[PDB]
Amino acid sequence: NSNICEVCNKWGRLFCCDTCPRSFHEHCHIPSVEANKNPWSCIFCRIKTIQERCPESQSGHQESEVLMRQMLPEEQLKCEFLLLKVYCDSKSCFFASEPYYNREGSQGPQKPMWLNKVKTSLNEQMYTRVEGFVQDMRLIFHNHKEFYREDKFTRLGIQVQDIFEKNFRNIFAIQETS
Ligand SMILES: [Zn+2]
Ligand SMILES: [Zn+2]
Ligand SMILES: [Zn+2]
């Protein structure tokens, strides 16, 4: 197995996947690395299994149909994985914890949102459809773009949204278009 966390790229107290060489800090993995379970298979492995059991799941889908899906176990897992792929980018640090807003010429968003809040919401089974998770994720970046206006820091929102959207299209097998 790797000697660094797959998500934050640091060493430390690492839990190793039994079916692939990745490793994780306990609370870097999503869901948090399970107490017992021998063998243990990481979320990467669990997602690859879904695909392998239903190869047709990789055919193109319309975003509108994906969003309306209820959060059954496989969709819960897919949203957990997509959230983890965003934490995998170091620029996620800016969006992880609860933000505050005091900038001359701007007013804070009406509905603040952040990664750790989305993480808690998934853990608590608060989303009933894929749409709820996706709307909170996109709200993170939209709030950022609106608040930072012409400051060049707006770009961090565009960058991390791009990581979210590429991973959304991959994980939920969105039909490719120009
Ligand atoms: Zn880590
Ligand atoms: Zn694995
Ligand atoms: Zn099948």
For the CA atoms of 93, 95, 99, 105, the dihedral, rounded to the nearest 10 degrees, stands at 110
Cα-flanking dihedrals φ and ψ of residue 57, to 5°? Answer: -60, -15
* Token code pair at residue 26: 């306990």
- Say how many CA atoms lie within 13 Å of 86 toward its Cβ: 30
For the CA atoms of 101, 103, 107, 109, the dihedral, rounded to the nearest 10 degrees, stands at -30
- Cβ-in-10-Å burial (0-12, 13-18, 19+) of 22 comes to buried
Distance 15 CA to ligand 1 centre (A): 10
Distance CA 59, CA 56 (A): 5
Angstrom CA distances, 129 to 55, 85, 87, stand at 23, 20, 22
- Quick one: which ligand is closest to 59's CA? 3
Helix (H, G, I), strand (E, B) or coil at 12: coil
Structure-token match 């509108």, residue found = 64
Query: What's the fold here for domain 60-178?
Result: Histone Acetyltransferase; Chain A (1.20.920)
Angstrom CA distances, 26 to 5, 89, 94, 121, 162, stand at 9, 18, 21, 18, 27
- Pick from 78, 120, 77, 69: which is nearest to 98 by CA? 120
Q: If you compute the radius of gyration of the chain from its CA atoms, what whole number of angstroms results?
A: 17
Resolution in A: 1.5
**Ligand 3 being an ion, which residues bring their Cβ within 5 A of it?**
54
User: Is there a common fold for 1-59 and 60-178?
Assistant: no
Structure-token match 């992880």, residue found = 96
* Token code pair at residue 156: 């961090």
Q: Where are the domains of the chain?
A: 1-59, 60-178
Three-class DSSP labels, 64-121: HHHHHCECCHHHHHHHHHHHHHHHCCHHHHHHHCCCCCCCCCCCCCCCCCCHHHHHHH
Helix (H, G, I), strand (E, B) or coil at 16: strand
Level-2 CATH architecture, domain 1-59: 2-Layer Sandwich (3.30)
Distance 51 CA to ligand 3 centre (A): 9
User: Which technique?
Assistant: X-ray
Distance CA 8, CA 60 (A): 31
Question: What residues contact residue 105 under an 8 Å CB cut-off, 6+ apart?
Answer: 149
Cα-flanking dihedrals φ and ψ of residue 16, to 5°? Answer: -100, 140
Question: Do 44 and 17 touch, CB atoms closer than 8 A?
Answer: yes
Distance 17 CA to ligand 2 centre (A): 5
